Design a protein around this ligand. Sequence first.
Ligand SMILES: [Mg+2]
Ligand SMILES: [Mg+2]
Ligand SMILES: [Mg+2]
Ligand SMILES: [Mg+2]
Ligand SMILES: [Mg+2]
Ligand SMILES: [Mg+2]
Ligand SMILES: [Mg+2]
Ligand SMILES: [Mg+2]
Ligand SMILES: [Mg+2]
Ligand SMILES: [Mg+2]
Ligand SMILES: [Mg+2]
Ligand SMILES: [Mg+2]
Ligand SMILES: [Mg+2]
Ligand SMILES: [Zn+2]
Lengths: 60, 206
Amino acid sequence: ARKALIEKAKRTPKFKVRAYTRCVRCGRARSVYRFFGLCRICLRELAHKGQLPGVRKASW
Amino acid sequence: GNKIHPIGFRLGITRDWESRWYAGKKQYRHLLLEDQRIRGLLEKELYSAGLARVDIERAADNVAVTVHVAKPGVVIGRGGERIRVLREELAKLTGKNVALNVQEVQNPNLSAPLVAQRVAEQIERRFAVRRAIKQAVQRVMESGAKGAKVIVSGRIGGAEQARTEWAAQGRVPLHTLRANIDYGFALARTTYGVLGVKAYIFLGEV
RNA sequence: GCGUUAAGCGCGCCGCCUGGGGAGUACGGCCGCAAGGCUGAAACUCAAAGGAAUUGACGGGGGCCCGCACAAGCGGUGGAGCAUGUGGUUUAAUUCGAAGCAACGCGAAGAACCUUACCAGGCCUUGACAUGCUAGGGAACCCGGGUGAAAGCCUGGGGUGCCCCGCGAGGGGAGCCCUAGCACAGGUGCUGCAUGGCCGUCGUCAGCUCGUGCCGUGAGGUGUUGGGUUAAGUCCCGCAACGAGCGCAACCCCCGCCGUUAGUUGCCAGCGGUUCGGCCGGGCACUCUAACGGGACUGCCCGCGAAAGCGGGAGGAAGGAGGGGACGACGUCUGGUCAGCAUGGCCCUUACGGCCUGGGCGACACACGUGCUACAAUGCCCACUACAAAGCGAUGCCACCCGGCAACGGGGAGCUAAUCGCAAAAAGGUGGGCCCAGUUCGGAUUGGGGUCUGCAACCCGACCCCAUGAAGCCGGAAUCGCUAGUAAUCGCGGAUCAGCCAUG
Ligand SMILES: [Mg+2]
Ligand SMILES: [Mg+2]
Ligand SMILES: [Mg+2]
Ligand SMILES: [Mg+2]
Ligand SMILES: [Mg+2]
Ligand SMILES: [Mg+2]
Ligand SMILES: [Mg+2]
Ligand SMILES: [Mg+2]
Ligand SMILES: [Mg+2]
Ligand SMILES: [Mg+2]
Ligand SMILES: [Mg+2]
Ligand SMILES: [Mg+2]
Ligand SMILES: [Mg+2]
Ligand SMILES: [Zn+2]
């Protein structure tokens, strides 16, 4: 998550196919979810703290 | 590594969402994100006051923001000029145009987040950890409540070894999906490393 | 432990000890046929040697007792082709981590570029990013040109208003740009045996403790042991304990019957019209929908028991925790992660910083792991035809027509979606073909053509079509999962995602 590498927000990609999601908290661009924009970690946490509306702990 | 978050494990019942509002599909993320921003500002500012929780409701370009503090006077300010700057500073961040409420804390001695930061501070002030702890605990214990329990990370005292401190009275049932246990985590930066502070508080039942 | 068979209370006398090792050894002496025996040191050396008892761990000790742990049983893995991970080989690089169970389709829910952290080459230094300082020119910013792979280097012209003071030229000054110096950014650069955080794991195992009292010089023990019962330290009875906490359970979610609520789901179920496709009238009954609520408690009857609890029966949708989730104690391992994030210390700051193109993360003659597809007729191919759930969709799902063998293109309706689309579900059923053969089994490899995505598909994409049609005839030692709607088997969906190596 090198600050520099956090330049996805640099619209100008030269070729859209070069854009990539990146976490919006960890930077951890590995496995992010579009809906929230959260590095799978920076999501299970907020979802626990309760800062993610309706994001209830699933269960069936 | 174990023991799920007592809060999130209770989000369905005895405990609710810090950010309640609807939307989705193509706004959620943007909107949601917006929340982390506020909470970002409210936290770096209303610290010396006792930020306890940050409810954030929405109804389209009309947010709520209801900061929970122990010393609301600090949030407010002299006659209320500071609730003018924050309230205004919040806009330069979100043009959504929202208000800002401030609900005092009925004996902060019962707000986990606070019972922790309390401890946290002491630690950074180089105070025997074992004490602040036993101290905090008794406080809660002694200010109503049916159960309390404080946990502090390692390096307690700059020990070269990463330890753990306990202390806890009354009943504190993390497994009972009804108990309604308040939780809170205080971080502790320090000359020798970082110490985490966990505080649970058990109140009544429903 | 001893206790009138005292290790009690006393008296008489005798022997003997005065740290361990060196040593019962050396020497002297006495004794013996001899083997040896009795008497018996020190130098040296070590901070101990040692006794009883407590907790625990361990035992090829014992009793009791659980878990697909074994057995019974079904399917599979180890053989092959391939896919994916890992090692070894190897490479300019093949970035890094993970390692017995508790690493090995694991981080990586998506490496052609990006990502990417590695390698070569070109290139920038207050920097791709944050706040602030000194001197100076000009300042916002917008549009061309040259070298170039790109970056970047060099460079050209439009264009400054904003506040105050001044007739005005013009000067001062705030936000900003740029050269230069500085504080400093930045670092996926070491350390998770400095850490938070979160996770794994023994263990969803049944346990781990506390208060008060009692026992004990004490460490601690008692309660938490015992008999019985339980999925369980669950409950009963006993007992110097009486309790209580964390855990167990219950509270919560989904599936089982039912009711209430609500009917732009659903139905000739009841009625008339029909382009008989429930299409329209109409009605909410049923289905479904999503909310609340009722409902099993060994409550009921028989029988065993002190009691708990256990066997059976009855009513009932459901029975003794109805199935499955969510939920993982005090603690273990210096378990994992400083590459998610955070942070202590160390280290780099014409560089372990940053940009770019190309390459690498994808190679093999090797081994293993986890997988898929098979080796066939309880099958395989073709035509016809039937029943599902759960999700997804505006910078998307795409009906319908025409084109092309097809991938798919071109046109193009509906839908911000229970009431449009992805969709045909497949195995199945019905007719028929193949007839046991590497064979209409198996689809690898390879040749050739072609579509799409994407700036680009050589290194490295998916897909369609023809051709080729390999290893493979059910797997050595050894090894895995599963006790039900499970295993086995058959499809459909999603996340990431341009596309996609998902046989995960
Ligand atoms: Mg960082
Ligand atoms: Mg002798
Ligand atoms: Mg002699
Ligand atoms: Mg002895
Ligand atoms: Mg002994
Ligand atoms: Mg079982
Ligand atoms: Mg067996
Ligand atoms: Mg094999
Ligand atoms: Mg029972
Ligand atoms: Mg159990
Ligand atoms: Mg439970
Ligand atoms: Mg280690
Ligand atoms: Mg790889
Ligand atoms: Zn994140």
